[PDB]
Amino acid sequence: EWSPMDPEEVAFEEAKCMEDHFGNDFGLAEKWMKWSLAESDGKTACYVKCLVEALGMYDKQAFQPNNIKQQYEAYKSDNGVDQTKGDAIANELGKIDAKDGKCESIAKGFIQVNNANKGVLEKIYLLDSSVRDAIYKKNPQIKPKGISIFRFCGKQFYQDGEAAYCNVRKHGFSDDPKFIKHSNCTTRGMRWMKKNGEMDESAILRGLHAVNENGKDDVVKKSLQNCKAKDESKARDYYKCIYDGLGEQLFMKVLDYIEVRSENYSYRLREATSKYDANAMRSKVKALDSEAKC
Numbered sequence: 001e002w003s004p005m006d007p008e009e010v011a012f013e014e015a016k017c018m019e020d021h022f023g024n025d026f027g028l029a030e031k032w033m034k035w036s037l038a039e040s041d042g043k044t045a046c047y048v049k050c051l052v053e054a055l056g057m058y059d060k061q062a063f064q065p066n067n068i069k070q071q072y073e074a075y076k077s078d079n080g081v082d083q084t085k086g087d088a089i090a091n092e093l094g095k096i097d098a099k100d101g102k103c104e105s106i107a108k109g110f111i112q113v114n115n116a117n118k119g120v121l122e123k124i125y126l127l128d129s130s131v132r133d134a135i136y137k138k139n140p141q142i143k144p145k146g147i148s149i150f151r152f153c154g155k156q157f158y159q160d161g162e163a164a165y166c167n168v169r170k171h172g173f174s175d176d177p178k179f180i181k182h183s184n185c186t187t188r189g190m191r192w193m194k195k196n197g198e199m200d201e202s203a204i205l206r207g208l209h210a211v212n213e214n215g216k217d218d219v220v221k222k223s224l225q226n227c228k229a230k231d232e233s234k235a236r237d238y239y240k241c242i243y244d245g246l247g248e249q250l251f252m253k254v255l256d257y258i259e260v261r262s263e264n265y266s267y268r269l270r271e272a273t274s275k276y277d278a279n280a281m282r283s284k285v286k287a288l289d290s291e292a293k294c
């Protein structure tokens with residue numbers, strides 16, 4: 001089921017749709033980040049479809065006005081949109097064609113509504129820079145941009161420089177009791193574990209393909225299938241199952257790149273940081289060790 005999303009959740013989902021559809025056209029990716037959605041750019045049609053489904057705007061045959069209303073209500077004290085305009089676009093979007101559910105059908109009505117209320121959707125869905133940043137400042141429990149998911153989780157459970165923490169940095173795993181909470185936080189933050197507590201196999205494979213690995217899909221599937229996990233330590237156990245299946249070297253190569261990208265989800269969509277560079281990763285991992293005082 002869908003529920004209101006915080007600015008980190010929307011930014012995560014937006015970046016995932018952009019990566020899946022931009023097709024190495026960075027100028028088109030730049031337009032999407034600015035929400036310059038124009039039917040006339042080839043790939044934009046199916047990108048909008050990805051975006052509205054991921055944001056809970058589109059479900060069955062047409063849009064869901066009560067989802068958009070729920071998203072507006074969840075952050076009305078911060079989105080800067082009047083109650084009149086809020087309920088307006090919810091109903092205004094829920095009067096769309098849709099019906100069949102094609103890319104060009106949903107994108108046409110979305111681009112049409114977006115241009116009639118420019119900037120309002122970015123505010124309601126917490127992608128507007130001022131709305132996003134104010135929410136982050138008032139909600140320290142949400143991971144903001146500029147800090148990695150592992151560092152954000154690590155600061156909750158470990159003292160900087162403590163031995164168990166530096167083992168996590170060095171080997172990606174720890175036997176100490178705090179690692180159950182930490183790996184639950186990071187596996188969920190990486191979306192390897194979904195909100196409902198179940199593993200997302202495709203999300204793990206995204207991390208492998210990001211570092212240009214290709215033959216290990218059926219290896220990950222077996223690790224998950226044969227894993228004996230108890231609900232008290234569910235994420236930790238699946239995390240260790242993936243660790244053992246891939247081995248430390250490959251597992252950490254995947255995790256290090258996930259960590260670097262988690263500071264700003266648009267990382268791979270800028271051209272200079274669009275390609276995995278194993279040589280550049282060494283100094284990035286070193287800087288993250290230093291940040292943790294390890």
Ligand SMILES: Nc1ncnc2c1ncn2[C@@H]1O[C@H](COP(=O)(O)OP(=O)(O)O)[C@@H](O)[C@H]1O
Nearest residue numbers: 007008011015129143144145262263264265266
């Ligand atoms: N919590 C977050 N964690 C990681 N990346 C985030 C988060 N929130 C937003 N982002 C990313 O931040 C990017 C914006 O970075 P930057 O362009 O320098 O900031 P701004 O919006 O001010 O331009 C967005 O495209 C989004 O992907």
Ligand SMILES: [Zn+2]
Nearest residue numbers: 170171172248
């Ligand atoms: Zn090691």
Ligand SMILES: [Zn+2]
Nearest residue numbers: 215217218219
């Ligand atoms: Zn096969």
